[PDB]
């Protein structure tokens, strides 16, 4: 379907950014939207082939879009401001009589200083012996904390294989310091298995948190390790007890 890149982007206030959209082949119409947290998508601009027929949604002159060959489109935002923080969506359709197909979106977070960027710390909490005795089930909890921006994807891996069944991850990262605008975040996830599965010491559980941060093009002058895109994991082995 429709693809977008980068999927995540953190930028320092005042820097320029470029968001790319690769629409479905042959789709004449392309739409760009800006979606702020807890809000619905807001229309930005429209293209019919290479012609930008309606750009009434562009916030200011800092926003510019192009679709030079009637296919790939780029949305550029110059001198980014905190208010630009949002998920930018792109969609394409064959034409007016047809439905729109959306990309996965590009989540942009604009921060005052890149020193605000931190990777998550990850910890796994083993099941309660009481839950095991009472329900014959075992719930593991993963906590990802202290990260910024809120650009993460958490997954569970058992014996080297990703699991989907029995997992429940929070929809959105929580602010550790609600009062601060550059507050770091925390995210939790649960993996529930049968008691017998947890009691097997041969079973290996790993909580993996993919963090999206700085790239090679970003400068870094802090003493700590550069907070680049990376995975941070925590593990636990089954226990007989």
């Amino acid at each position: 379907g429709v693809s977008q890149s980068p999927r995540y982007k953190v930028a320092k206030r005042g820097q320029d950014v470029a968001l790319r959209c690769d629409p479905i082949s042959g789709h004449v119409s392309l739409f760009w939207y800006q979606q702020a947290l807890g809000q619905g998508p807001e229309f930005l601009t429209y293209f019919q082939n290479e012609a930008q027929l309606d750009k009434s949604g562009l916030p200011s002159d800092r926003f510019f879009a192009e679709r030079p060959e009637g296919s790939v489109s780029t949305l550029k935002i110059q001198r980014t401001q905190q208010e630009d923080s949002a998920v930018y969506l792109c969609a394409s359709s064959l034409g007016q009589a047809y439905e729109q197909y959306f990309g996965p979106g590009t989540r942009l977070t604009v921060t005052e200083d890149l020193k605000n960027v931190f990777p998550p710390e990850v910890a796994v909490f083993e099941p309660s012996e009481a839950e095991i005795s009472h329900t014959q089930k075992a719930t593991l909890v993963c906590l990802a904390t202290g990260f910024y921006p809120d650009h993460v994807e958490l997954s569970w891996w058992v014996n080297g294989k990703e699991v989907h069944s029995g997992v429940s991850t929070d929809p959105q990262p929580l602010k550790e310091q609600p009062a601060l605008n550059d507050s770091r975040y925390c995210l939790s996830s649960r993996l529930r298995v049968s008691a017998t599965f947890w009691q097997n010491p041969r079973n290996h559980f790993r909580c993996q948190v993919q963090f999206y941060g700085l790239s090679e093009n970003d400068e870094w002058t802090q003493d700590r390790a550069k907070p680049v895109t990376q995975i941070v994991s925590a593990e636990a082995w089954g226990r007989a007890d």
Partner: protein
């Protein structure tokens, strides 16, 4: 312009009627519905200019006076939980297919818990963490989890966990903190929980 209720709750397997208000629309105007699942981009659901328009998942209904429309989900499942947008685009003139998404309605689909077994468990601490974690789980879908009255205590909202292998669903919430006075016995004190909730001792 259209308006919809801010949110709506439904139980799995139940049909769901999502209402939409709008100015009288002509017999040539179409109503479109899109939905957006968590952290995903929007997706088309259905559109039409009359009632009795449908597909697998849903049907569209338009009131006789054309002042309201309804998206009917025949059999809601957990995966149907999402934000639903009722859109009334322009037809004719210089229209090109522009869609104006409003705020939409948040649909939450609750699991039908056959055998509630509410309990609060303390999980084993982690060597690299100074936090203590408490798990409130297996309670009926009618139970609501509130935020704590402490800034040092973090509590997530309830979420559903589906163990498809055993066709078993459960509701749960987590609370954690590094405070010394923090204990699972009081972690969820700001929430109205079942009186028969199990607290291991």
């Amino acid at each position: 312009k259209t308006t919809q209720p801010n949110s709506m709750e439904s139980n799995e397997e139940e049909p769901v009627h999502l209402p939409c208000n709008h100015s009288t629309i002509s017999g040539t105007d179409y109503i479109h519905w899109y939905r957006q699942l968590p952290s995903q981009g929007p997706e088309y659901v259905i559109h039409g200019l009359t009632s009795n328009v449908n597909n697998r998942m849903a049907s569209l209904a338009i009131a006789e006076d054309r002042k309201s429309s309804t998206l009917i989900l025949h059999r809601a499942t957990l995966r149907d939980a999402a934000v639903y947008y009722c859109i009334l685009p322009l037809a004719g003139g210089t229209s090109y297919g522009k869609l104006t998404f409003g705020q939409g309605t948040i649909l939450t689909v609750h699991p039908n818990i056959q055998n509630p077994d509410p309990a609060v468990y303390q999980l084993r601490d982690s060597k690299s963490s100074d936090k203590s974690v408490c798990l409130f789980t297996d309670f009926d879908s009618q139970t609501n989890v509130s935020q704590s009255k402490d800034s040092d205590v973090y509590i997530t909202d309830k979420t559903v966990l589906d163990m498809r292998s055993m066709d078993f669903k459960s509701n749960s919430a987590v609370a954690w903190s590094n405070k010394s006075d923090f204990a699972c016995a009081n972690a969820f004190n700001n929430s109205i929980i079942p009186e028969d909730t199990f607290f291991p001792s």
